Homo-oligomer: A and B are copies of this chain.
Amino acid sequence: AQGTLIRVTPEQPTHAVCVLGTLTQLDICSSAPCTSFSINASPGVVVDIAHSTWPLDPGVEVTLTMKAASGSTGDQKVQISYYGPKTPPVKALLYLTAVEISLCADITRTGKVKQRTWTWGPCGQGAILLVNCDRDLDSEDLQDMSLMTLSTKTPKDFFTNHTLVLHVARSEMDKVRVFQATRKCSVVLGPKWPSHYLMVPGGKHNMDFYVEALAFPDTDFPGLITLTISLLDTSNLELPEAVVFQDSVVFRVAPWIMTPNTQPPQEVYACSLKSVTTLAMKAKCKLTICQDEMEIGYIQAPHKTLPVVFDSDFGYVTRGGLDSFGNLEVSPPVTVRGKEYPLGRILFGDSCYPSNDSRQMHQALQDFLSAQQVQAPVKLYSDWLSVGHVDEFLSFVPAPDRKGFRLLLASPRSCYKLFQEQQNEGHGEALLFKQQKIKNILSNKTLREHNSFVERCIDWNRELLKRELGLAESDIIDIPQLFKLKEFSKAEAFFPNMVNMLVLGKHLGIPKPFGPVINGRCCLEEKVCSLLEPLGLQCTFINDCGTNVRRKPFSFKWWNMVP
């Protein structure tokens, strides 16, 4: 393991402490007389040595390991006999005192307290801390926190000459807060003070501390917070305190995680019309009435997962229009050229390159999402849309076969083909919605070029999503949809944007495109179903849209990922 080096002499005896679990090396030649030596000691001390030898080479390795906490000070002895030529010299005396000092937490992400660094994966190590989320003591308010325990086994009179201090680095104090459990609970470490003395009794004992995080990861906080325990010697009243042994635990603050439409819906919210309440109903989901300016995510720790709302028993964060959460989505779990993204991959749009007229999500948001590493953000292209949200051109719906989902991309092409197949059939006179006929729309050269330009933007995202999400054409479904360049050549929907749907599990709430009515049945409405129904989706069309959807957190534990 790790440890110290003791120096013994024929001069006088040496007193020293040895913490169970550490490597105690012994320096024998330093103040030695005589050519060889012999080591004999108490039963509780296993004196192992290599090149138990007899020479006096300073290359000899004499390490001691104690087998258990002593009952009193100096229970174990180590006698160093120095002999040589034709003499029987001195015997160096060493009185050790073994103690047990374990600062331990839930390093095995299992909700139960049982290599000095935090490591990802299912075969990794490291306790986890949830950030404290609250807008404006005992278990009645400490189950959300992380338990850390300090157990000690030392001789009764041990803490008359040694004192334990618990500390955090000054650079991390403003990010954590530790509570001491008196078996009330008072704050011992925090933004205020970095260190604190523990009042610990000799013998077998152990106190509980409760830790919480005060900051999600961010551009200036990787997410690790370290708590160390120091065993200080204060046996000499004159000299200052001398650190005898340190040990620590490394916590990692849980990231904020977004939830994709492929997750079972748990609750829908709406603001002050009721096609949605009938939908949630069929969708086996709850429904409660009160604004799409926030996104419901979740933080998760072995001992507790907890919904957390993100705006600009619910947590909150407020980091801060491409600049709104309506331009924020998440792919479903996906694998790309090997690398596995179990929690999906966050999708948010902006522009191809920066200009005097380029919009983008505020840099403080982008940097934040990236800081949570677990869903490695992907920049799409949406700046081409008047409003600018990626939801205006994409969507994800649950599938029952391939990868388990399907990418829906708006598609002007799929609509011209549909209106064309419609004209050929003799319905070129059908009215959409001024109200234009399916043939004027088709003959409109100007409208045609516009969509042709939109096809380009969406197609550019088709390839982007294909690369970053590792998708295949077989994972994509083009939904017939038209567009029109209005404001500053920016794009708007030429009719209810259907790909801007409320995916509530397996039941979809799609905007009704009052399109060309054939056989008393809108062709678009009809086409959309012939694309989704064979997948199991239940298409229902509504008219207009303020809604949010709290969804079920991934069974997969974010910390088992391997970013």
Which B residues are in CB contact (< 8 Å) with A473?
Answer: 58
Is A243's CB within 8 Å of the partner chain B?
yes
Contact A239 B453 (CB under 8 A): yes
Contact A459 B220 (CB under 8 A): no
Is A551's CB within 8 Å of the partner chain B?
no
Contact B243 A167 (CB under 8 A): no
Q: A417-B31, A463-B4 are in contact. Are A246 and B352 (CB under 8 A)?
A: yes
How many copies of the shown chain assemble into the complex? 2
Is A236's CB within 8 Å of the partner chain B?
yes
Which B residues are in CB contact (< 8 Å) with A366?
Answer: 171
Contact B363 A171 (CB under 8 A): yes
Contact B240 A453 (CB under 8 A): yes
Stretch of A207-215, A324-332, A353-361, A493-501 on the interface side: A353-361
Q: How far is the CA of A166 from the CA of B26 in the complex (A)?
A: 65
Q: How far is the CA of A286 from the CA of B5 in the complex (A)?
A: 43
Which B residues are in CB contact (< 8 Å) with A5?
Answer: 459, 462-463
Q: A466's closest neighbor in chain B, by CB? A: B5
Contact B354 A170 (CB under 8 A): yes
Q: A220-B219, A354-B195, A360-B170 are in contact. Are A453 and B236 (CB under 8 A)?
A: yes
In A401-435, the 8 Å CB interface with B consists of: 413, 417
Scan A140-156; emit 1 where CB is below 8 A from any B CB, else 0: 00000000000000000
Output the least CB separation between A466 and chain B (Å): 9
Q: A31-B417, A353-B195, A355-B195 are in contact. Are A489 and B363 (CB under 8 A)?
A: no
Contact B165 A449 (CB under 8 A): no
Is A238's CB within 8 Å of the partner chain B?
yes
Contact A354 B449 (CB under 8 A): no
Of listed A31, A352, A360, A485, residue having the most chain B CB within 10 A = A352
Which B residues are in CB contact (< 8 Å) with A220?
Answer: 219-220
| 16 cross-chain CB contacts under 8 A | A7-B413, A167-B354, A168-B354, A170-B363, A195-B353, A195-B355, A220-B220, A238-B449, A239-B449, A239-B485, A242-B453, A242-B456, A242-B457, A243-B353, A243-B460, A246-B352
